[PDB]
Scaffold this active site. Structure first.
Site, PDB file in Angstrom:
ATOM      1  N   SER A  42       0.843  -1.189   0.000  1.00 40.63           N
ATOM      2  CA  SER A  42       0.000   0.000   0.000  1.00 40.63           C
ATOM      3  C   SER A  42       0.887   1.251   0.000  1.00 40.63           C
ATOM      4  O   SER A  42       1.917   1.276  -0.678  1.00 40.63           O
ATOM      5  CB  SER A  42      -0.976  -0.033   1.183  1.00 40.63           C
ATOM      6  N   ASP A  94       0.923  -4.076  -4.717  1.00 45.58           N
ATOM      7  CA  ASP A  94      -0.327  -3.462  -5.150  1.00 45.58           C
ATOM      8  C   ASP A  94      -0.413  -1.972  -4.817  1.00 45.58           C
ATOM      9  O   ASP A  94      -1.429  -1.486  -4.311  1.00 45.58           O
ATOM     10  CB  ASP A  94      -1.527  -4.227  -4.586  1.00 45.58           C
ATOM     11  N   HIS A 146      -7.300  -5.476  -3.575  1.00 45.65           N
ATOM     12  CA  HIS A 146      -6.319  -4.691  -2.814  1.00 45.65           C
ATOM     13  C   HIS A 146      -6.386  -4.905  -1.304  1.00 45.65           C
ATOM     14  O   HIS A 146      -5.351  -4.946  -0.637  1.00 45.65           O
ATOM     15  CB  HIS A 146      -6.464  -3.195  -3.117  1.00 45.65           C
TER      16      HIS A 146
END
Ligand SMILES: CC(C)C[C@H](N)C(=O)O
Length: 1273
Positions: A1120, A1147, A1230
């Site tokens: 993140s 991601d 996610h």
């Protein structure tokens, strides 16, 4: 904008000190639900809620406290304002449409909003209630109130009244409640009291208390956080009755009884009769006539200090306690933290005892007949404030609870505590007139375990003179070398004969049985021949150290009654001027050969004396111990602490005046080994020793601990050919043993402990492990013919793990002291656990370790407790002896007219080292509390006759030494934090060691000061915890050792592997989250950082990874927002010069520009719903913010399993690196990528990157690596 008008005001008054503190806590530290109580009541039946609301409004009128709100903002003293009318509403909620679990989840949801919501004491009614309908006659009911206007005890009175009203109203029936005396009356009382007088009372109560860490030795110190854990138990119905009836005949409370038995229990864990713990008291003072029906805040936690005087019994103790209970009554309004602020003790109380008068649990669940419903369950929310809490409530058989922090205490320990408490309850009340110190507190299971389970097995094998064992070794193989000195070697044959000769000449001259023979030999073959001759003639030998002064020998001569004296010829000044008109015979003498070389048939009783050697103990003159044939058999025959054989070569390095030598001589000579006697000049000379060892092929050796360490620092070769190395006499030096271990390997080093009176050593620790986290080396387990008992002063078995006097029994215990029946009777006693046997009280302190090995805790006569720390005063003395250029040094401890002790160092030197030279050294060598407070310098120390120790009366130290260097803020941090102190206390020139309350501080300011760091010019820290940390140093300690990012703060997983990875936090900002990822990272060691909110967080990570890994290829990670952080990181590494092997993004993409703040921090926490939760908003608010507003490392991206359309302000890392930008696709969206079964598919791939595996190495590169890893050693 005031929520109320003057008309509404009915009354107003000042706050109790407790209230006042609770209010400020609230203002300064809201959200932490300190004083929010919450009781959930499971209600099965018909419930008229409407009528219950109406009934609650009657109570609302009945009790002022519910109509009270508080004013504080602009006013010198805060004020409680009672309103004429306040209307109460019950939030009613229907959950009938939901499942069991769903209903439970929703209610748990309401509760948690409730716990963080708190009350706004400015305006809210300080109580609310929600009722949740689960089914037609099924309700869950949640009450919440602020402690500022009620305590648990009161709460019940209110509920009782609520239901009388309730039942009256729903049946349209009249009712009547008795007049209620207003809370204002308690405030009036409180205003008549002298707060300073009350403070004085406590100060006097606790005067001279040396502090306490309860169960110190059992506490675990690993990472912080409370892990709540619980053990419910109760005595028998009978045990409970006798308990209950005894409290009455003695006229005391059940509570006071419970505290009496607890005191005796902890008595046996603390090595002390001065004891303390918290207790909750009613706070309802006798002098308010109807005080017992008022409703509001009364209960308080206050300290109990108990002094178990010599011989005090249980009934005596009860009296003691009930008496001081009264005395304290008028002073219970004082907040505990004020009691502590003036006390001397940080850790004043540690744990607390509660006897809930009549629990809300047990009392309230009675007769649905009247109420129309059953309260099937009740449950209060309990805030874990101490690491151990004893709580009890009355019942047919009494309900006891030990509630504890299992991060500190093992359940196994709380289990033992349970059974010791239960035993305590039995024995104490059954025997309420015996000295408490005499009562037994171990159950049978534990008693058996301690006596039988922890000691060696019972052995048959028994008994035969030394002469017999020696005959065994000789007959084995007469031609085997027995004895060697300076080349000259003797066979078991030759040695035997030379000893028969000497045994006969002795016997001729009238040695025989019952006499003592004085040896006067320098180390030689003769020395040994003397010993055997004396034993073979049925006598006892007395080794006389030739280097002793004439008059110490003359003493030993007379005292022993030495009829005869056996010598050498190089010692031909046995004449000298000793004198000695007794018979004296040489085995130099060539006239010896006239007698026979067969032995006599000297019938010998094992229990007869074998020898006498004197030691210094009886402060004054030295005392002779009588050692026995059977004694010596115990050390060397039928023992399984390893085995010695015909194939061993021993080196004796121990003076024959000390019983180390009895091991040397008897362990060799009775196992048919070779004994090498080192010459006098070799004893403490490491080069000679090493050569003798090398040239004689010695494989076994006993060295004093000092010689062992000495040898170990000189070289390695001496030890390399040794199969076994015994040592003892002092505390093992772990660094040195660790060095020996690595050269020698396991099963080789043995640490040995024993008083003379137990014959050489009674326990032995064969070193195998040496855990990196090792404080003191164990002294191990008893040898096979010995027993050990850890006892109190009255011979009571201590709890498993408690410290106590190490006592010894078995075959090794000597026949006692020559010509001194008084001393023998004092140290030597009948073994209470084994008829026939004798017990020696060593004077030393010890405890059993969980593994059954023994940990030595020092001498009883050499102890001092400072700030709840048992200090061994010889450990600080030895640190002074080692400081380069020192000579002598001793340390006394004393207290003044109080009991408040301190430690003075004394040193003789010359004019080499100044006063503070020594203080600088200990500062970091020893812990703070062990550093002496003065350092008086002397030419010499006083003595008193034969005195290695000194005439205690050294001079009262000079008071200039109390005056020390003012040290003002060391850094910009402490300066600005000393600024607020200055502002708050209104006082300039504050050093980092000044006491806050000593400077005029008190309750509010302690908080108010901790508040000014908590935002308004600062950076946030525990409020009611400057009572905790009264010195700025202590608070820099709190926030550098336990503040943010360091040895403790940034998470670590997978420790005892190797391969480090360096993570970066997600948008929420906390490394605790990848804990769940660490499992699926089996070989790699993790560094899970937090988010640093500062703009120059860059350099902090630059400092962090530089420490955690200094050189080599670096591997960073980021999930993140942790990606653009981890990139803005490697750029600095390689900017500051540090190679990054690769990075693994997960991601999350590049910041190619910029694009509400809190609502989406909340909305993204709403897709993610105190220790982990408190500072969760204000950190995520900033990192989520920081996000929205090239390197050489290879980059690996693991993407979402869900499709994705790229913003212009986001983009791939392709450009952001020069090297290999490889990437793969993971499973899960996610969010769910790093949680559940989706995480476990994303893991395997994270290997592929880290794995790589092929990683083609060169031959030069490969070989070099191998030789590199090898030289490491
Ligand atoms: C610890 C015991 C084995 C005592 C022995 N005499 C020594 O010098 O250490």
């Amino acid at each position: 904008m005031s929520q109320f008008s003057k008309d509404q005001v009915q009354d107003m008054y000042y706050l109790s000190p407790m209230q006042e503190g609770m209010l400020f806590h609230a203002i300064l530290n809201p959200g932490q639900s300190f004083y929010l109580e919450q009781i959930t009541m499971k209600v099965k039946g018909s419930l008229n809620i409407k009528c219950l609301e109406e009934s609650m409004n009657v109570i609302m009128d009945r009790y002022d406290v519910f109509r009270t709100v508080f004013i504080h903002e602009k006013v010198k003293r805060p004020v409680q304002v009672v309103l004429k009318k306040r209307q109460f509403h019950i939030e009613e909620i229907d959950l009938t449409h939901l499942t069991g679990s769903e209903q439970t989840a929703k209610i748990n949801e309401y509760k948690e909003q409730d716990k963080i919501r708190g009350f706004d004491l400015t305006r809210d009614i300080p109580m609310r209630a929600a009722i949740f309908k689960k089914a037609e006659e099924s309700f869950e009911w949640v009450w919440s109130y602020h402690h500022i206007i009620l305590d648990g005890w009161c709460f019940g009175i209110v509920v009782q009244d609520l239901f009388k009203v309730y039942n009256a109203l729903r049946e349209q029936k009249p009712y009547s409640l008795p007049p209620v005396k207003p809370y204002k009356d308690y405030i009036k009382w409180l205003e008549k009291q002298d707060k300073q007088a009350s403070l004085r009372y406590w100060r006097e109560y606790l005067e001279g208390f040396e502090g306490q860490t309860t169960f110190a030795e059992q506490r675990k110190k690993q990472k912080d956080g409370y892990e709540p854990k619980e053990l419910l138990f109760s005595p028998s119905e009978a045990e409970t009755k006798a308990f209950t009836e005894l409290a009455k005949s003695q006229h005391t409370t059940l509570s006071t009884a419970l505290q009496a038995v607890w005191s005796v229990l902890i008595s046996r864990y603390q090595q002390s009769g001065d004891l303390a713990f918290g207790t909750v008291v009613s706070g309802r003072p006798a002098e308010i006539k109807g005080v017992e029906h008022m409703v509001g805040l009364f209960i308080n936690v206050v300290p109990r200090r108990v002094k178990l005087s010599e011989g005090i019994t249980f009934n005596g103790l009860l009296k003691r306690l009930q008496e001081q209970s009264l005395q304290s009554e008028p002073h219970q309004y004082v907040p505990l933290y004020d009691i502590q602020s003036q006390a001397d003790q940080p850790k004043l109380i540690d744990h607390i005892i509660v006897f809930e008068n009549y629990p809300l649990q047990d009392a309230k669940n009675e007769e649905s007949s009247e109420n129309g419903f059953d309260m099937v369950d009740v449950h209060v929310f309990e805030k874990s404030n101490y690491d151990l809490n004893l709580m009890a409530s009355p019942g047919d058989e009494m309900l006891i609870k030990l509630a504890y922090n299992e991060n500190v205490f093992d359940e196994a320990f709380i289990l033992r505590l349970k059974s010791q408490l239960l035993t305590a309850i039995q024995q104490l009340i059954q025997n309420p007139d015996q000295p408490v110190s005499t009562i037994n507190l171990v159950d049978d299971r534990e008693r058996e375990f301690l006596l039988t389970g922890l000691n060696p097995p019972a052995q048959a094998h028994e008994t035969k003179p030394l002469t017999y064992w020696f005959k065994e070794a000789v007959n084995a193989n007469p031609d085997a070398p027995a004895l060697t000195y300076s080349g000259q070697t003797l066979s078991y044959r030759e040695l035997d004969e030379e000893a028969n000769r000497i045994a006969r000449r002795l016997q001729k001259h009238g040695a025989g049985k019952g006499s003592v023979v004085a040896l006067y030999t320098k180390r030689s073959l003769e020395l040994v021949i003397g010993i055997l001759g004396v034993l073979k003639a049925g006598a006892a030998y007395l080794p006389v150290d030739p280097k002793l002064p004439e008059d110490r020998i003359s003493y030993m001569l007379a005292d022993s009654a030495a009829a005869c004296l056996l010598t050498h010829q190089e010692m031909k000044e046995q004449a000298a001027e000793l004198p000695y008109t007794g018979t004296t015979l040489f085995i130099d003498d060539q006239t010896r050969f006239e007698e026979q070389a067969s032995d006599p048939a000297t019938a010998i009783d094992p229990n007869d004396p074998a020898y006498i050697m004197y030691t210094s103990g009886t402060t004054g003159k030295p005392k002779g111990n009588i050692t026995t044939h059977a004694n010596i058999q115990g050390l060397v025959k039928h023992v399984d602490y390893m085995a010695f054989s015909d194939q061993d070569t021993f080196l004796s390095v121990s003076n024959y005046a000390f019983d180390a030598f009895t091991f040397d001589f008897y362990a060799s000579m009775l196992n048919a080994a070779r004994l090498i006697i080192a010459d006098e000049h070799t004893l403490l000379d490491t080069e000679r020793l090493t050569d003798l060892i090398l040239q004689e092929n010695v494989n076994v050796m006993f060295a004093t601990t000092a010689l062992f360490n000495l040898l170990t620092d000189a070289g390695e070769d001496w030890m390399k050919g040794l199969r076994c190395i015994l040592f003892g006499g002092e505390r093992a030096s772990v660094p040195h043993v660790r060095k020996a271990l690595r050269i020698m390997g396991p099963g080789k080093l043995i640490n040995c402990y024993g008083p003379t009176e137990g014959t050489v050593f009674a326990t032995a620790h064969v070193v195998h492990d040496l855990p990196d986290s090792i404080s003191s080396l164990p002294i191990g387990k008893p040898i096979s013919n010995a027993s050990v008992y850890i006892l109190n002063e009255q011979s009571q078995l201590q709890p498993f793990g408690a410290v106590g006097e190490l006592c010894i029994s078995g075959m090794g215990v000597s026949k006692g002291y020559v010509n001194r029946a008084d001393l023998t009777k004092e140290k030597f006693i009948e073994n209470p656990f084994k008829p026939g046997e004798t017990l020696y009280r060593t004077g030393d302190l010890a405890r059993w370790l969980p593994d059954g090995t023994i940990e030595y805790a020092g001498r009883i006569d050499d102890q001092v407790k400072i700030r709840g720390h048992r200090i061994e005063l010889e450990e600080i003395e030895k640190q002074l002896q080692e400081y380069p250029g020192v000579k002598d040094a001793v340390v006394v401890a004393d207290r003044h007219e109080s009991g408040d002790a301190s430690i003075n160092a004394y040193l003789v030197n010359r004019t080499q080292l100044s006063a503070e030279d020594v203080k600088a050294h200990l500062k970091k060598q020893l812990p703070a509390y062990m550093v002496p407070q003065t350092f008086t310098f002397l030419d010499e120390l006083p003595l008193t006759t034969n005195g290695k120790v000194n005439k205690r009366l050294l001079p009262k130290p000079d008071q200039d030494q109390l005056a020390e260097e003012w040290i003002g803020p060391r850094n910009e941090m402490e300066e600005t934090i000393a600024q607020i102190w200055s502002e708050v206390l209104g006082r300039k020139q504050i050093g980092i060691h000044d006491d806050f309350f000593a400077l005029g501080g008190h309750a509010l300011k302690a908080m108010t000061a901790a508040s000014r760091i908590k935002k308004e010019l600062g950076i946030d820290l525990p409020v009611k915890l400057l009572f905790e940390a009264p010195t700025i140093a202590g608070i820099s300690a709190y926030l550098k050792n336990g503040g943010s990012d360091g040895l403790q703060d940034v998470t670590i997983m997978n420790q005892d592997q190797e391969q480090i990875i360096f993570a970066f936090p997600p948008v929420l900002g906390y490394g605790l989250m990848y804990q769940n990822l660490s499992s699926r990272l089996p070989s790699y060691k993790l560094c899970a950082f937090d988010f640093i909110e500062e703009e120059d967080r860059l350099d902090r990570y630059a400092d962090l990874i530089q420490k955690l890994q200094p050189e080599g290829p670096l591997t960073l990670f980021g999930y993140s927002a942790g990606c653009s952080l981890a990139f803005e990181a490697a750029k600095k590494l390689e900017e500051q010069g540090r190679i990054v092997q690769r990075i693994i993004m997960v991601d999350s993409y590049k910041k190619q520009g910029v694009s509400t703040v809190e609502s989406d921090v909340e909305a993204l926490m709403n897709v993610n719903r105190e220790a982990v939760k408190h500072g969760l908003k204000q950190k995520t608010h900033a990192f989520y913010s920081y996000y929205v507003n090239q390197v050489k490392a290879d980059i690996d991206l693991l993407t979402s399993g869900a499709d994705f359309d790229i913003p212009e302000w986001l983009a791939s890392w392709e450009e952001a690196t020069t090297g290999v930008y490889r990437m793969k696709r993971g499973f899960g969206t996610h969010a769910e990528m790093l949680q559940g079964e989706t995480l476990d598919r994303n893991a395997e791939i994270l290997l592929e990157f880290l794995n790589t595996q092929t990683v083609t190495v060169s031959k030069g590169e490969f070989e070099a690596y191998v030789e590199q890893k090898l030289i490491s050693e």
